[PDB]
């Protein structure tokens, strides 16, 4: 009778959850927090959008949770040992706790959307925006992962790479921008521009990962990523009949090596044999010119987003 009484109370109440419980499972998240530029981009865009400061703070909080959770998952998916100079959370807390915590935070971000407005129709549109772009992020990330983990089953072309980026990287840029446009009390949609910034952002990220090492650890090679320069190299070699170079690029990607000389050989194949680094540097410039023809500040600090 005492047991049934205790069970009866348990099942007729909400689940018990303490602030101690909350802190214990937030460890992976508090850790990546230790790692303003994203705020700056939102603030600049707001000069166009004019959301009041309180609503903008909530948009920013949503973005931070989604961005940091994506990073925790990403580092697990990439077997990344370091993030911004420090040990990745999954190596400290384990893969299980980090996945669970990152996913928990996607839902906390979802929860915040309801703090943006009391108007049901608007609320509906905001959640639809949140839902669509998170679908988009997972689609792009799934393609990137598939190409990499199943190489050489699929050799993406430049067009395929760009479409994967539109989903993968464009997802969070458009999510932030679309919520703002929807909330704005105030010209043409800025979605095209934010798609371009996300593409510049990704290709420049791929580029610097190698260029910094040729002159960071070029960890994209260790991970076997189908980066923009690698995609150009693989298609260039196929096209020109450079069979051995095409096969060697694939072999080095498939080694998942941390040997620096092997990584340097691959980068110098890209520098002298396929001219992929020059091709990419020129591609980024052409993309930056499409705009330049506060914003420039952002574009020069794009790598700190």
Ligand X SMILES: CCCCCCCCCCOc1ccc[n+](CC(P(=O)(O)O)P(=O)(O)O)c1
Binding footprint of ligand X on the chain (CB under 6 A): 38, 41-42, 63, 67, 70, 74, 141, 168-169, 172-173, 176, 202, 205, 305
Q: Is 182 in the site for a second copy (CB under 8 A)?
A: no
Cis preceding-peptide flag for 152 (omega within 30 of 0): yes
Q: Which of residues 197-216 bind a second copy (CB under 8 A)?
A: 199
* Contact pattern for a second copy over residues 126 through 165, marking x by CB under 8 A: -xx--x--xxx-xxxxxx-xx--x------------xx--
Q: Least distance in Å: CB of 134 to ligand X?
A: 11
- Say whether 78 counts as a known binding-site residue: yes
Q: Which of residues 70-89 bind a second copy (CB under 8 A)?
A: 73, 76-78
- Say whether 225 counts as a known binding-site residue: yes
The CA-atom distances, in angstroms, between 51 and each of 18, 123, 171, 248, 251 are: 35, 15, 21, 52, 51
Structure tokens at 232: 């150009």
- Cβ proximity to ligand X, 45 vs 237, nearer residue: 45
- Say whether 169 counts as a known binding-site residue: yes
Cβ-based burial of 107 (10 A; exposed 0-12, middle 13-18, buried ≥19): exposed
Q: Least distance in Å: CB of 297 to a second copy?
A: 21
**Dihedral pair phi/psi, residue 143, rounded to 5°:** -65, -45
Q: Least distance in Å: CB of 225 to ligand X?
A: 8
Q: Least distance in Å: CB of 275 to a second copy?
A: 16
Residue 290, contacted partner among ligand X, a second copy, none, CB below 5-8 A by kind: a second copy
* Residues flagged as binding site for dimethylallyl diphosphate: 83, 168-169, 202, 209, 225
**Residues of the shown chain interacting with a second copy in the complex, contacts defined by CB under 8 A:** 3-4, 7-8, 10-12, 15-17, 21-22, 24-25, 73, 76-78, 93-97, 99-101, 103-104, 106-108, 110-111, 114, 120-121, 123-124, 127-128, 131, 134-136, 138-143, 145-146, 149, 162-163, 166-167, 170, 191-193, 195-196, 199, 283, 286-287, 290
* Residues flagged as binding site for isopentenyl diphosphate: 38, 67, 84
* Residues flagged as binding site: 38, 67, 74, 78, 83-84, 168-169, 202, 209, 225
């Amino acid at each position: 009778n005492k047991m049934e009484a205790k069970i009866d109370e348990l099942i007729n109440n909400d689940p018990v959850w303490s602030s101690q419980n909350e802190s214990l499972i937030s460890k992976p998240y508090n850790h990546i927090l230790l790692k303003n530029f994203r705020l700056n981009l939102i603030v600049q865009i707001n000069r166009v959008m004019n959301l009041p400061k309180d609503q903008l703070a909530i948009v920013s909080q949503i973005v931070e949770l989604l961005h940091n959770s994506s990073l925790l998952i990403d580092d697990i998916e990439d077997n990344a040992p370091l993030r911004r100079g420090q040990t990745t959370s999954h190596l400290i807390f384990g893969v299980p706790s980090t996945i669970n915590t990152a996913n928990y935070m996607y839902f906390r971000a979802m929860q915040l959307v309801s703090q943006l407005t009391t108007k049901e129709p608007l609320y509906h549109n905001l959640i639809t925006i949140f839902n669509e772009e998170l679908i988009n992020l997972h689609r792009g990330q799934g393609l990137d992962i598939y190409w990499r983990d199943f190489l050489p089953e699929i050799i993406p072309t430049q067009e395929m790479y760009l479409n994967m980026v539109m989903n993968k990287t464009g997802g969070l840029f458009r999510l932030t921008l679309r919520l703002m446009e929807a909330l704005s009390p105030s010209g043409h949609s800025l979605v095209p521009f934010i798609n371009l910034l996300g593409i510049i952002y990704q290709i420049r990220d791929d580029y610097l990962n190698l260029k910094d090492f040729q002159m960071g650890f070029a960890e994209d090679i260790t991970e076997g990523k189908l980066s923009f320069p690698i995609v150009h190299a693989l298609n260039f070699t196929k096209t020109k009949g450079q069979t051995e170079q095409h096969n060697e690029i694939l072999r080095i990607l498939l080694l998942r090596t941390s040997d620096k000389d092997i990584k340097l050989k691959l980068i110098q194949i890209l520098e002298f044999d396929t001219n992929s680094l020059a091709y990419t540097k020129n591609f980024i410039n052409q993309l930056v010119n499409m705009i330049k023809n506060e914003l420039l500040y952002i574009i020069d600090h794009l790598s700190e987003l």
